[PDB]
Amino acid sequence: DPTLEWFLSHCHIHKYPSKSTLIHQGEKAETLYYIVKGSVAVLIKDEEGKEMILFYLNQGDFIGELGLFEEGQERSAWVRAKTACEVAEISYKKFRQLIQVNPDILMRLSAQMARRLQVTSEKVGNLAFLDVTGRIAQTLLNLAKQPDAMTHPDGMQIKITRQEIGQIVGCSRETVGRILKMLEDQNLISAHGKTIVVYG
Amino acid sequence: DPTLEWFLSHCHIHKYPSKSTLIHQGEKAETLYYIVKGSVAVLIKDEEGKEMILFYLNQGDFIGELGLFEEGQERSAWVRAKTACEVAEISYKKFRQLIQVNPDILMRLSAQMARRLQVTSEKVGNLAFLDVTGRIAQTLLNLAKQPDAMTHPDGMQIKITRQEIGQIVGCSRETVGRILKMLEDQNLISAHGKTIVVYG
Ligand SMILES: Nc1ncnc2c1ncn2[C@@H]1O[C@@H]2COP(=O)(O)O[C@H]2[C@H]1O
Numbered sequence A, B: 001d002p003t004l005e006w007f008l009s010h011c012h013i014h015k016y017p018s019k020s021t022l023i024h025q026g027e028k029a030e031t032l033y034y035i036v037k038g039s040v041a042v043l044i045k046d047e048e049g050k051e052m053i054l055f056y057l058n059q060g061d062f063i064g065e066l067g068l069f070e071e072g073q074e075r076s077a078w079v080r081a082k083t084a085c086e087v088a089e090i091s092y093k094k095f096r097q098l099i100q101v102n103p104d105i106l107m108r109l110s111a112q113m114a115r116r117l118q119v120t121s122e123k124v125g126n127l128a129f130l131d132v133t134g135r136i137a138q139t140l141l142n143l144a145k146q147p148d149a150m151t152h153p154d155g156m157q158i159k160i161t162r163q164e165i166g167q168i169v170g171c172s173r174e175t176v177g178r179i180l181k182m183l184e185d186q187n188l189i190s191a192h193g194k195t196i197v198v199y200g
């Protein structure tokens, strides 16, 4: 996109090794980010530092946008490199000015925001209205519909530990274990190690 | 405000009686809304038509924004007049043009979006980490910490039907019933009708 390359040329680019943290919750938000390459997890934690994956973001996604519209706010979640990443960065001050030149940039951002809101609402709905078996089932679908969802002859094919799922659904890797076996008995999936086969 | 009366003068204004539905989930999203007066609930339902209040929006809040950034989408939730309302309305087509004249309007929208995303993410935390009893307990605290939370000699004091709680937590008024009694046995609250006493 020629409009992204306009945006990007005003950004400093920094590579982050898989597993490194780009954003720490609670920091002061003063900068926007943009994933040029790679993917990251958005996480939040609970009292005893228990993690919950709240979204996966990927190349082309902005990050750190939520403190852009009002000065003096804090990062609302940790963002962690899922794989090695290359992330552009820019101060909100500089970015607000781009918007002044070309509003189309703010338009691109708002669109990802509107979509994260839909998805997150749906996630809210999922926790309220599904049994932990139901969520784990939903989570597999959504994972096999990730841009990076691979392909298998009997459906889609994903990789993910039982703990990651556990964090996505808010259950333990133990519970995730039982339910994965159960869904496999119902021949809905197939688990050979850390590779699940979802059908669709 | 100068920008906002500009926005509004391009809108048709319609009054909605308390309890009437402004947006039906699944409809095609082609129009933006703006609450000139009153408040509404955003709800989603489950398989057996069970409701979950997902947000309260009020005078000054836009509604129906989530299908604005991509043509051909569906209302992501029902929006229902909490009290009698007066809601401006405008087609997305007209609104995209305003943005072209003055981007500041898209800037006001994005800000409410960024805040709904923070709040909704927060709510996802609770749902993941709190069972039906835990949530109902949390909900009472938060309610007794409302600006309008009254005072009692043994703690705070609130008013709310069991159904309202049911909607806050995504459970039925029946379930809310059991759990309220249970919490009362644990002498954590006291329910004499539609007035609960949370202790401390
Ligand atoms: N529900 C969500 N969906 C997607 N991304 C999110 C969500 N909540 C927070 N984030 C991202 O997490 C980032 C961390 O801090 P910010 O709030 O500054 O910017 C945030 C957003 O980019």
Ligand SMILES: Nc1ncnc2c1ncn2[C@@H]1O[C@@H]2COP(=O)(O)O[C@H]2[C@H]1O
Binding pocket: A117, A118, A120, A121, B023, B029, B042, B054, B055, B062, B063, B064, B065, B066, B067, B074, B075, B076, B077, B078, B079, B116, B117, B120
């Ligand atoms: N998580 C949420 N927080 C706040 N408002 C929401 C949320 N999810 C949906 N809405 C509102 O529900 C409206 C119904 O359809 P739209 O998606 O067009 O626009 C929606 C938003 O205004």
